[PDB]
Amino acid sequence: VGYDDIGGCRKQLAQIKEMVELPLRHPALFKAIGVKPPRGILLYGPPGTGKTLIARAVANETGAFFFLINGPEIMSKLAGESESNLRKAFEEAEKNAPAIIFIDELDAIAPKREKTHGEVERRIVSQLLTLMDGLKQRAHVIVMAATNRPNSIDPALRRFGRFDREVDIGIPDATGRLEILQIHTKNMKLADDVDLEQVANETHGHVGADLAALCSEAALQAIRKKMDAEVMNSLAVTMDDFRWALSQSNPSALRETVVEVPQVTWEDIGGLEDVKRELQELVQYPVEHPDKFLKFGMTPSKGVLFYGPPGCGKTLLAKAIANECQANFISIKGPELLTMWFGESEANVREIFDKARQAAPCVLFFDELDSIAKARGGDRVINQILTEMDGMSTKKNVFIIGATNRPDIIDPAILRPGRLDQLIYIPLPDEKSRVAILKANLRKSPVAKDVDLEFLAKMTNGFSGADLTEICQRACKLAIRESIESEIRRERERQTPVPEIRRDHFEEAMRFARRSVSDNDIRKYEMFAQTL
Amino acid sequence: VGYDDIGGCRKQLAQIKEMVELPLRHPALFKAIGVKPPRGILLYGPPGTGKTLIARAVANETGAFFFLINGPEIMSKLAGESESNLRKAFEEAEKNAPAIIFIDELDAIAPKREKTHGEVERRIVSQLLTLMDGLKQRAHVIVMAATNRPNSIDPALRRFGRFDREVDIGIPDATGRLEILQIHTKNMKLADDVDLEQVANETHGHVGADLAALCSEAALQAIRKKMDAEVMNSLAVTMDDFRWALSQSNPSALRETVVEVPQVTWEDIGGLEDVKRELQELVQYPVEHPDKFLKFGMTPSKGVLFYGPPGCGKTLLAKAIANECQANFISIKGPELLTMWFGESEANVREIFDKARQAAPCVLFFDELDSIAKARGGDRVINQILTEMDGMSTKKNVFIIGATNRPDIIDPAILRPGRLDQLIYIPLPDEKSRVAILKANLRKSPVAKDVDLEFLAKMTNGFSGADLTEICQRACKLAIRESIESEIRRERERQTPVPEIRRDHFEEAMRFARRSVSDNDIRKYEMFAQTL
């Protein structure tokens, strides 16, 4: 029970705990600073990490009394006793200076006032905000507040003096998932057979409660394996029990955004690394020497775009720059662009931009402008996008990564200054870069070195890296088909090793000659670069 | 009264009963596991199977006390006594550890809070969730909850700690219908004349209550046959009484989706069985050797599509792959595609995808892209479809079966990776495959072998299998017309056997020469395959 019980929330938890322990350890020296007695901790975010339990554990780690609030109980109780409970919270903050005022189900307590028809409920919200505004700033009661999002939050409650700061839940790490597994490994009796890291790498879309449920699913599989107080020492959480849990795993945290760093850092492919050095001067030289930008006297730019083979390493180039920045990435989904354009929902894109302002620094992969442009041609949200492009200052400088293969007809104001400055003419790979992509495909692949990639790159100079990855997946499919064939022959004949890919599958993919590249698209990219 | 009383719900009933009997038989060893004390059983689904009675029977089979709740009575009663009844449920869970807390009409108890204007009702929902959150996790009271769907369910109630798991009603089997008929056959006195299986095969769109009503309709027909305590031994539920019930049968379970396996498994037609082996490597080789996919190091694909004769065995090919997988199928209805595109309703398609995520593994027959594409040309829902195509991981791998006869202009992002990989150029059948279709049409047909199918396939090489099935139905119509003519001649002359189809009807259909195949469509499929 402490800060080690949560895995995957390092920075914001540290900042909030520093803000707490500034008043908690030294309330007298906090008054000697006298800067800001803030209390409002508005955790807007998804539960399942035990965020209220994280608040109670932070109270235990600070030693503060968890004077928590169940707002559903206040909604359950009759009125007045809710006001008496607010007065009880005030008298508890008087009685205990280290009172952890933890507001749970606050969106139920505080909805939109237009949505609120309950005048007793609105009076209770007024009494709660009046209790919130009625602060002597001396009782040291931190107003922890739990929400799923701040959309239901009233702006008067979200005003300063009623709100101090907000906390996002975020996406937990697979390392943080292994930490939560270790938290579940207090009475594990695991088999030491499930990896709990690559398994945790596979555990996207799962909360820590979903991790405990997967532990329960492995336990149910083990209970089925036991088939009947004797098999308790025979508990062994295998990777097969993990596979039963994973087949039982539905994505609990599905349909949500996440900001995260990849692990490529141009090791998938090099080439045009002057543009990578331009990104490095954009990132680290601003990160190290903003005073050199002052000495130059010109401000930094906002973003750049790309033209050519879209996604064929290009989305991997965005992820690789995020790895190279060691910074959290987020990509503009084209289906969300249709939901903003044809679906007509663009304020949520402004909400995502404001979330990125809360998550600054980050990476803005604004891909697929050509797709929404051809959807309109075969914008209003792009007006909001350009408004945000003007609306972003040089506060942590979340760089724009524009990407369109047919970028020749997108937008001139986006092409104008106050926006992105470069359009990366991303060409096809070299045969050296093709061999680099071949080695990257050989990474996480147990194929032998029996084939000649130099002759393969010499043949497939006119093939895409995505077409090369397709050839790698096709050779892996042929090898898996050969492994399944060997298993079928062993079951059919031997029961009644083929761990690599031969150059026969390479020659089979070579005879499978479907070069997906279009020379008219090359001429179009050439006309765009000639226009550039 | 037990698990045999329900027919047609095997897997989910077993999983929930295993979860129950883990705490029911060994609550001490469940604490020795200590994994998850879950109680929330959210049966969202249609009634008429006696699902609340299934809950009470599961309580009887576990020996637990059915401490059920009538939420309509709580809505009927004045407030406070509802809170006293919730306290009574808590004190009953204290008094009886094996308490089956069965919540009935929960959507009436818990609607949408925006829809909820009742502040006393919202306070009662808050008191119920506070009772639900107020768990010591020791009273062993499983929170069985009954809903039609989870749409009316509040997400705070659907949150973890308030919700554990959900149960779908599903489509009962015709074997399960015969089991429910056997449940009705405790005081049957049937004639042993109604089949109760082929009759149950005919009983689509009927609940178990509709089965008891059909028993009542046969009883009413028998009461009309009796015409007046003496005919009780003269009770005889005939197939004529079954026909009276079936004429009386309206489809009770009409307008709903269902996921089910067919019984073809490429026995209707063979041909291009390398694609069937590709589906087999996609299904069973993933089902047997996902570790071989790990050893290959490349992940599996998502789906494939088809081009050519649409539905002429092609929908039967989807159903045959579902039979070959022995797995539940579901097809994208084109009228639902118009209701998503022109009717503008695509979140319910995401709801169907999430239901398939609850019903994983399943088959996604995403047919008729060309129809909605030409409807737009003569998409926003397709944006959600592509979002779901990206939104599906390799968790039980519900394969996409795309199908369009005019697939040449559908969507490039669907044609892009992260989506389906193959477009099956489904050609016209061979004369061997035409004879196979002739034998399949001869299945469930009492026609003789007097005609020559080899000469018939030799003539109708340029005819479709759907055109061949049309010829089979036309010959069956001519045979039925001949049987009706023989009956009219017997009634008109003999009262005052023709069980097969002659080759005369074959030559009549042969002279009925309307080959529906278009050679320009063949040229279009050829241009598509040349583009492929």
Curated annotation (Swiss-Prot), chains A, B:
This enzyme's EC code(s):
3.6.4.6
Q: Residue positions of the PTM N6-acetyllysine?
A: 292, 295, 449, 524
Which disease is this protein implicated in? Inclusion body myopathy with early-onset Paget disease with or without frontotemporal dementia 1: An autosomal dominant disease characterized by disabling muscle weakness clinically resembling to limb girdle muscular dystrophy, osteolytic bone lesions consistent with Paget disease, and premature frontotemporal dementia. Clinical features show incomplete penetrance. Frontotemporal dementia and/or amyotrophic lateral sclerosis 6: A neurodegenerative disorder characterized by frontotemporal dementia and/or amyotrophic lateral sclerosis in affected individuals. There is high intrafamilial variation. Frontotemporal dementia (FTD) is characterized by frontal and temporal lobe atrophy associated with neuronal loss, gliosis, and dementia. Patients exhibit progressive changes in social, behavioral, and/or language function.
A single GO cellular-component term on record: ficolin-1-rich granule lumen
Q: Which residues carry this modification: N6-succinyllysine?
A: 449
Q: What processing steps or modifications follow its translation?
A: Phosphorylated by tyrosine kinases in response to T-cell antigen receptor activation. Phosphorylated in mitotic cells.
Reaction catalysed by this enzyme: ATP + H2O = ADP + phosphate + H(+)
Q: Source organism lineage?
A: Eukaryota, Metazoa, Chordata, Craniata, Vertebrata
Tell me what organism the protein belongs to. Answer: Homo sapiens (Human)
Task: Give the record's family classification.
Answer: Belongs to the AAA ATPase family.
Phosphoserine-modified residues are: 252, 483
The protein in question is named Transitional endoplasmic reticulum ATPase
List GO BP terms, alphabetically: aggresome assembly; ATP metabolic process; autophagosome maturation; autophagy; cellular response to arsenite ion; cellular response to heat; cellular response to misfolded protein; cytoplasm protein quality control
Main subcellular location: cytoplasm
Domain remark in the UniProt entry? The PIM (PUB-interaction motif) motif mediates interaction with the PUB domain of RNF31.
